[PDB]
Amino acid sequence: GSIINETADDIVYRLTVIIDDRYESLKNLITLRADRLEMIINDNVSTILASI
Amino acid sequence: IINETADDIVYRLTVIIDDRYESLKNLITLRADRLEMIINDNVSTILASI
Amino acid sequence: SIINETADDIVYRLTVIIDDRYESLKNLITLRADRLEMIINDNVSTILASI
Amino acid sequence: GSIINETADDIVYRLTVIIDDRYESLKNLITLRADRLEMIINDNVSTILASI
């Protein structure tokens, strides 16, 4: 009763922290590598146009 | 009770997982769409400049 | 026992949820990466054939 | 601990291994495809610059 649901709420909270923490890390890596690809791309097109 | 509680756990954590998965799915699609639009735009600029 | 049985059930069910969400994101990442690689290599060969 | 405490610990552990693994594979996948794109982009910019 006070144990079954406190152990239910505890499982959910503990796994929610794991899931949230892994998710935010994936969110940051996608944003990081996409931002990085776009600087690389923007720089290279600037270089090509400035070399023509 | 033991089964009602287990169903509650699986359900609640399944809402979390699906929400996180959905936002990542959207993020991947957004950034990939941006990249495809950026690459096409830039190549069209190069082609009109050579 | 009703405790271990229910625990194995929680793990199995949620593992399928996670695997499904994982394999779907794996496929999306591979797909969008594959397209971007093909768009780049197509567009570069187009430039090179035009210069 | 209690049986419910050791059972809840085993649920969280087994699902944390699953979550982490699927996370780690997506981490390596995103890094891999971003690296592949950058290798392609940089080969192609050096080919364009040497061709104009």
Author numbering:
A (entry chain D), D (entry chain A): 1 to 52
B (entry chain C): 3 to 52
C (entry chain B): 2 to 52
Reproduce, without paraphrasing, sentences from the article in which this PDB structure was first reported.
Although the polydispersity of the sample increased, the cumulant radius remained the same over the temperature gradient.
Carborane, C2B10H12, a boron rich compound with applications in Boron Neutron Capture Therapy, binds into the hydrophobic cavities of RHCC-NT upon mutual incubation at 50 °C. We observed that the chemical interactions that stabilize the o-carborane inside the cavity are mainly hydrophobic, mediated by the amino acid side chains of Leu and Ile of the respective cavity. Based on spatial analysis, the two center cavities each have a spherical volume of around 240 Å3, allowing for binding of the o-carborane clusters with their steric bulk of 148 Å334. The nanotube has a length of approximately 7.7 nm and a diameter of 1.8 nm, binding three o-carborane molecules.
